């Protein structure tokens, strides 16, 4: 007595074989466990079907004449006010809509045949609150909005899980931006009241980081190199000629000094002795020792062995101590014997500025 | 006896000046060399005209009430099973459809008023086959789907000749993506079945490339730096402190060594002599030689000149050899005279690891 | 007699209270000083409205089903040829199109809900002329094309104002690339008509710079090194071994001279007294003085001490001048007493070249 026509969205519509009493084709379909009834002038499956839900909501299926689009509407009890609308097409793409309790738009999702989609939500005043764009390869950019339609949050998600998050002030101007990659590493930028860069911190996967402050002239006014081992170099008050004050912060003490474009000089003085930690522009440590003392039996000198980062000090023809500047960024003292030819005991890590100064006596 | 009305789809319908014997207006038009005849109540040009092709297939032209649309249908001999359908509107937008022998959809091209278009092909079971989107700037994305209707392949081609190729697996999951830029360089990514990046490969404009394997923590486990000259640095077993095993694959021989945060050291030992090719993080090479031998009569010292990438070897105050490390990534030997001052012969290219070793003797 | 409904674009559709003669709903609105009559089945403000401009141009507003989008087209007198099209949408995003005098695209602008936009200009033939994408964080890819459709300029500006500029040729090949960072530091490369690197300039964050011009074979034909305090060196006409004419540019004065594979020699004379400043490949500074005079009580000779870079001059067995060459790159002259035992007062920085020729008298 009837043939089936199968439709976009996996559904079938049943058309009467012969025309009915009114001169119309009867139509019957089952959607979400609910039976729908309809008539039309055509026998191909086109036309419109109604049905009522157990909760008195009204359901309206509408199939287009060429059968390439089903429209499924869910109305409240009164027939006028909308609850949800789904448009589906032969290529599987769709548009699903949600509505508030006035039949007015809440949510809209558009899904394309390649499964990509853009989504939008609207508050009760009809102003955008969030928008999400999902791409063919599952990657996503979500953005949030305040009540005055302005932007407040943006989050790009990359195919490689890497994400970028961007905050905006109440005015929609960029206030801050952080890439966070698959390494656990990240680059983070702060932006001033004028849209300019004020702060930049590149963190690396081994917890290490480098951070620069920027000034009115957009130069690097300060730089903080943070090493993975916890310590750090701190360059403050950087001028235009690449020079400023340098401060190395170690577990326990602090080494202080100067910066020039070429090299960082970290000095520590004790009586006439000044020890000098030098770092090149590339970052290779080197150490030197100078002594004002005009007395041979007490004048200190020292040789630097860059292959073992050790510095050996001598007094009156005799090696006194080895200062090693270790790869984990610590200094260790070990003493020589009275003959000045054998290292005694074991290395000792220096934990106080007073202990460096103590070796310089 | 009649008036031409020019229509959308560039065609004209002819309408007679007054009615016919049955009170209707006569309409005649010629389409692709076929004369279509029709009768309508109205004389504005609107109505339906039919004609029959010589192979018996029926043509139907339907001009809308307001002359705002033309539907040109072409059916099989039965007049019911569609073969093609074209709906052109007044703003020049259009819709071309092609049908299979069952009268079901096979191609739909939608053309918009600004000449841009979306085009879709469906297979014989009615699943999507491919989709092509041409945009205003002539850039175009080409998507291919499988017999099951899931995405398999997508290629964006941009107006600047840049392209983003994406391949997908049996599950609609991104397996591999290749962005290639307008400057002819290209980032390429591969993905495991978990979503995570398994391999990245950056090719530069000059055909040099950096291939990277990633681990489960996201860190880089293996690196292959390929130079333009074809030779490659193979870093493998890369540990979290930045260190790892290294291998340089040169024409005819392999240098071996280790890798640390700052540099790659490539080592070749012969007797007490050890030659060391050092490569910087920026790829800057520098060589040095050391010799355990004490006998001034046979100790090899060597000085490096970075300006010409060359190492001269010295035994007994007299220069012995030049080892030049070239920009095409080769090494050449040239002996001095017995007086130790004049280079003799012509430089000779080293091709064997023995030949480097034999020069260090 | 009617009720207001507000729409995307902040415009107003008036729909009449109920049906009239044909059973339809009358729609009316105002757009840019023009009234537009319209009619429809549904009553929510959906449907089409048409109106005639004073210059005979046609206007067609188009309001969608869910009331979320307005289309405002304007046509030439015919109603076939497009002039303008402005789609506006509920999320406040928008799309404007301008058409030349065959209804064919000239400019397309897309404004998004997050206030950002892309812009496309087309040429009189129909090709893409230029495209600028602007993002929420104000980051921007810009590109311009020649009337031949080929790419000419591609510049990417990042959120923090750091940019990457590429210029191409007539054949669509890379000719000039410049990466420029937020440190104000920048790399710049220039490629010849054959794709090889012809020119290279790295500007660093402290305004330090290295320029290298590469010749026809690929070698370095010129080099210009600029320090952090502004002063610089010019190496011009470099050959295979490294031989070429050198030049130094210090604040106030310029030393001319020669550069060979090992070092740079700058030559100045006062009489036969030739002073030579010598800079090694590593940059180690050294100075010496030769006199052709055959008189022991007047002949000038000087000593070089590289422990404090001082050049001590002596004439007639008596010390006269200390020429200290400082690491901030200036020269100082501290005179001695009449005998040559005591130093007089403080040092004096040289401000003219006339103050280097005047010392060697």
Short mmCIF file of C-alpha atoms in Angstrom, two decimals, chain A residues 8 67-69 89-93 113, chain B residues 96-102 104-110 118-132 143 145-147 149:
data_model
loop_
_atom_site.label_atom_id
_atom_site.label_comp_id
_atom_site.label_asym_id
_atom_site.label_seq_id
_atom_site.Cartn_x
_atom_site.Cartn_y
_atom_site.Cartn_z
CA UNK A 8 18.90 13.47 4.34
CA UNK A 67 14.29 15.75 -1.49
CA UNK A 68 17.72 17.34 -0.89
CA UNK A 69 16.87 19.12 2.39
CA UNK A 89 21.13 18.34 3.40
CA UNK A 90 22.07 15.51 0.99
CA UNK A 91 25.81 16.19 1.57
CA UNK A 92 25.27 15.57 5.35
CA UNK A 93 25.93 19.28 6.24
CA UNK A 113 30.09 18.19 4.81
CA UNK B 96 23.51 23.29 -12.47
CA UNK B 97 22.48 19.71 -11.56
CA UNK B 98 23.40 16.42 -13.31
CA UNK B 99 21.65 13.10 -12.72
CA UNK B 100 22.50 9.39 -12.87
CA UNK B 101 20.51 6.87 -14.96
CA UNK B 102 18.15 6.37 -11.95
CA UNK B 104 19.22 10.75 -8.75
CA UNK B 105 21.73 13.62 -8.09
CA UNK B 106 25.36 13.31 -9.32
CA UNK B 107 26.77 16.86 -9.55
CA UNK B 108 25.53 20.15 -8.10
CA UNK B 109 27.31 23.46 -8.90
CA UNK B 110 25.92 26.55 -7.20
CA UNK B 118 30.60 25.59 -4.58
CA UNK B 119 30.50 22.28 -6.53
CA UNK B 120 29.68 18.79 -5.22
CA UNK B 121 29.83 15.31 -6.78
CA UNK B 122 27.86 12.35 -5.29
CA UNK B 123 28.55 8.62 -5.95
CA UNK B 124 26.00 6.04 -7.25
CA UNK B 125 24.80 5.10 -3.72
CA UNK B 126 24.15 8.82 -3.07
CA UNK B 127 27.12 9.50 -0.77
CA UNK B 128 29.27 12.64 -1.24
CA UNK B 129 32.31 12.01 -3.44
CA UNK B 130 34.13 15.33 -3.76
CA UNK B 131 33.47 19.02 -3.03
CA UNK B 132 35.20 22.03 -4.61
CA UNK B 143 37.96 18.02 -0.70
CA UNK B 145 35.44 11.93 0.63
CA UNK B 146 35.21 8.08 0.58
CA UNK B 147 32.30 5.73 -0.36
CA UNK B 149 30.99 9.73 3.25
#
